[PDB]
Amino acid sequence: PASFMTSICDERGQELIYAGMPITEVFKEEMGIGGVLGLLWFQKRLPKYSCQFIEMCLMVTADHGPAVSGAHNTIICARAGKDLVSSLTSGLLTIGDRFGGALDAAAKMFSKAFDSGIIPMEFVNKMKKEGKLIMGIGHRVKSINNPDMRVQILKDYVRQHFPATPLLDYALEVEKITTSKKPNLILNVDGLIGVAFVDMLRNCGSFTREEADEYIDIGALNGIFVLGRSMGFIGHYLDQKRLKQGLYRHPWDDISYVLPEHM
Amino acid sequence: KPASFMTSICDERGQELIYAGMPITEVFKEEMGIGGVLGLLWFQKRLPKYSCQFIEMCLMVTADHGPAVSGAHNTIICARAGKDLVSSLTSGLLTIGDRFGGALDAAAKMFSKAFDSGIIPMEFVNKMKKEGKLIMGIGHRVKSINNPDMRVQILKDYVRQHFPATPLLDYALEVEKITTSKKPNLILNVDGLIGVAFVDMLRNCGSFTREEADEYIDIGALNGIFVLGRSMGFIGHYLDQKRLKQGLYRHPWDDISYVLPE
Amino acid sequence: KPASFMTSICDERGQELIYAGMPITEVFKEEMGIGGVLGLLWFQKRLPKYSCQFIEMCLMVTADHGPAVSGAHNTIICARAGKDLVSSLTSGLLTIGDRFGGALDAAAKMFSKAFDSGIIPMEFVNKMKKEGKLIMGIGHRVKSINNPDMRVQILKDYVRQHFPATPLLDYALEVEKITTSKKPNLILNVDGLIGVAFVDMLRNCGSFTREEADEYIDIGALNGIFVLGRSMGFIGHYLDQKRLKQGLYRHPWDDISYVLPE
Amino acid sequence: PASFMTSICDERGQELIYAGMPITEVFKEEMGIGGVLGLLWFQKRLPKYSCQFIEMCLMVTADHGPAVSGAHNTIICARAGKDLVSSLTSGLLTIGDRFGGALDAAAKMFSKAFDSGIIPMEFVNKMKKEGKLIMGIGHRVKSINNPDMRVQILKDYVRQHFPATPLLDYALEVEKITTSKKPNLILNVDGLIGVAFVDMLRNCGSFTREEADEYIDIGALNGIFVLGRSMGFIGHYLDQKRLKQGLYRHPWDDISYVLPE
């Protein structure tokens, strides 16, 4: 009896198959990278606007400079003379709850609040009372004084193409409240993509409510940022190889050593 | 004090994000796509549209090749071990670079070295057979002339229809005519096609000098293409094992030979 | 500009290296060993000799458990793909977690909470079984009451002979009597044994307050013991695959059920 | 035919075995961590002085502060709220030719020079003429004026306990020359451990010259630093969490953005 099960790709036959679509049909149907992601991650032929939204998400998350945790770590590996994969992975491993990997939790938290019937102000006050950070809100450098154009682009697309945007609308109401409290509490790219994907999955017509919930629960949304930002991290690796930057060592003047005494 | 880091690809400090000198709104207004964003971030060039589309086609054809290959299998094992997406993806990516996923790069370098040495295809084939070296990017387990690899056919047709010049692909196709005459399954395979066509894009699209094209190949651009493309399939395998509720795996002892010292 | 980083464990700025307030020469003069260095670097404490020796025993008993387990299997595949030592080690380490090798933190937390709350062993088990929650540190795929784990025996024997008190181990063993009477594979596994024995060590060695001991459990120190110990074996498997001249692995299709959508 | 082959550990029986030794015998013989490493990596019961040297190497490489590439990367992951393994791995992935991973190359380069009969001065000149860095030489902060006590501790042990140290003696002659040229060109911890392991493996009696050279070739020596430094990287992970350190973002003033116009 077979010990493994697989559903997404069959490479055994005359032609490669992605989720029951032979590769020739993938190209004949002009499915693009977004359509291939729809097949491999969601086992569906998603609508064109959904495929294009996926591609837009990969484009807008591609890079955000060398200062962020993962790009900084990739740059260090590259400067340590490591190979592409080691350097990329060293940076990818920083993606999580604080940096880049709040899409899953933003989708879950905003969907829960919305579906439960609580209004935006009740959601904000409940999270504050419980000491819970709102996932998908907040940014170290972008703010109401320095808005995030990636969020604007995504919003504009969703409004032009999506048949329904109730969760995005709810999250934008939350953002009006949080930014009035502190200017950095914007709806960040993780929050935008997360809530937009809930609206997309629930209303595109390719999924049942249970199927959409399963995709959010198993972590598909965070994958969008991982795949998108991998392009920028590889770009930083290549750039540092071209720049011929030597081994980095962090300066002692930026480190406070406070070791135990009387040992 | 002087800056310790240098960067050339992206500037997020302003009001509007910039990728290699193009503000993010312009990237979208010019319909650059994923391939154009790659050209900006990896090469700091605005590539022609046909080159951007070829890059996307490469990412589509390399997206996945089933669960049995080294990296997909390692990602599946992590997923079955209850790990998170990034850990599982990275466990599989870490298998890439030599015997798995390294042939795009190896084929681009080998064919480029032969072409740049000024030797003709027959001299190249004979030099490799004398040196007991396999030609990288040549050979398939079952495909042959008149039974093509469809991934090769699709990409090759696009490249020949859109690229102004394809001298390295032309050379590789001349090598294929010779190797297939020796053994019919010695076709130009998908690694060979992508490798040589990617070199032809860098050398002939007009955005690079030869020094820049050769440098991007040397520092690993084709390793990047395989990694970025295949990451999509590996994430897919992670999600699939969770969808299929697959539990912890432990390899059976009946498929392991234990030969410890006496 | 104020310092952006804070650190407490090692100072390499002076002529002589310092580990947690001790110059490296003093570490060797005091014969601290690997276990004593771990006490300094992970806990910033001087530990009794039996605690240091227990730590070393844990690292020795977790060093390896064959090539079939998730992480060793992944390391081997990665070595067979021609990759380097660190990539291959890390591909295997990334499988460590809730199902394989990384149940020490959760076992320590769940047994400590039950023990501290005064719940008797049967009430803890029945609760967990009624709730469908797995008891972390219980269960094994191949070891059982019919095939006992000698690593557990060795650890138990040491802890009972050398520790001043073993209340959490004693509680966990009462739980194991109950779970193994239900199903023979529901043994106290190495993750459970080390997890509870470390709680007993931290709480009763005299180097920690209860609050300090609870914090190190909370932040995840205990899983580190298995990661550090098993890294020796995974490096061993990497070297073994090179010494055995093992080639590229591909999982056999006969062991995979392809159920794609129609 | 079996799809996997293995020779280091057999867990199929009632009692676990490491390279032919049942786990109870490992403890009965007081083999320690160093002895277990001898079994799992070298398939040998090594002499006690070799086992103790292995343990000393793991102790001296355990940590070297938070500024080095790998510790820094681990710290960044920890500050990004990641788990232990992800954070450790992010730092281990920096180990290589420049940082922590020059033991294999130092052993190879020094062994091939020594065996070739070339004297230390002519080896230094030959590498300089060929534009090749001497692996195992050099350090960013340790120098003639800021010596490395780890190297001193290791040297003292090797001189007191090893039966023969010809490669270490040769490397120390190379160091005298390179440090006269530039103060940073010390024999670093990678070079010391690499060359000492060649002396250990060739002269402990457990290996033939062929077996000893194969170990250098497959890359066992780099594993000593990886295994040792993993303790320090885990220590940094724990430390950042205990210190409740938040998400890090590098300051823009320390980055020169030079994009195309």
Ligand SMILES: CC(C)(COP(=O)(O)OP(=O)(O)OC[C@H]1O[C@@H](n2cnc3c(N)ncnc32)[C@H](O)[C@@H]1OP(=O)(O)O)[C@@H](O)C(=O)NCCC(=O)NCCS
């Ligand atoms: C991204 C992030 C680390 C940036 O935080 P920051 O700008 O450095 O802000 P600080 O951590 O200094 O916190 C400042 C204050 O804002 C509050 N705050 C920050 N982010 C918050 C959020 N998401 N929800 C609620 N309150 C938040 C803090 O609790 C703190 O309040 P206090 O003054 O009452 O203590 C943080 O907003 C966050 O963790 N967000 C959630 C994860 C996420 O969405 N990440 C993706 C963006 S990188």
Ligand SMILES: CC(C)(COP(=O)(O)OP(=O)(O)OC[C@H]1O[C@@H](n2cnc3c(N)ncnc32)[C@H](O)[C@@H]1OP(=O)(O)O)[C@@H](O)C(=O)NCCC(=O)NCCS
């Ligand atoms: C796919 C592949 C296994 C098919 O080969 P095969 O039909 O099994 O060939 P065999 O191994 O049975 O060898 C049969 C003959 O074909 C030759 N041959 C096979 N592949 C060849 C290649 N790529 N270039 C030149 N000659 C080749 C062999 O040298 C042998 O010649 P001989 O009979 O004169 O000794 C093989 O072509 C291959 O591995 N190609 C990929 C090369 C590559 O890109 N490798 C990347 C990792 S280095």
Ligand SMILES: CC(C)(COP(=O)(O)OP(=O)(O)OC[C@H]1O[C@@H](n2cnc3c(N)ncnc32)[C@H](O)[C@@H]1OP(=O)(O)O)[C@@H](O)C(=O)NCCC(=O)NCCS
């Ligand atoms: C290690 C582990 C995967 C082995 O599981 P296994 O032997 O393959 O058993 P299965 O997953 O097939 O489960 C079989 C039955 O035993 C039960 N079971 C297995 N582990 C259990 C646990 N830790 N607590 C309670 N019940 C358990 C299952 O609930 C199931 O019960 P059912 O017959 O009523 O449905 C599992 O015991 C586990 O996850 N343990 C907790 C994690 C841990 O401590 N890991 C370290 C050891 S590798």
Ligand SMILES: CC(C)(COP(=O)(O)OP(=O)(O)OC[C@H]1O[C@@H](n2cnc3c(N)ncnc32)[C@H](O)[C@@H]1OP(=O)(O)O)[C@@H](O)C(=O)NCCC(=O)NCCS
């Ligand atoms: C560790 C290392 C990166 C530190 O370098 P550093 O002190 O920052 O020195 P720089 O890179 O600024 O180079 C300064 C000069 O010393 C020379 N140099 C540095 N390391 C050298 C070596 N290992 N062999 C010969 N010359 C060396 C450089 O060539 C340069 O010479 P130049 O001024 O004539 O161009 C470097 O010594 C090295 O790569 N060593 C080999 C790898 C190794 O053993 N690493 C383990 C220690 S972290």
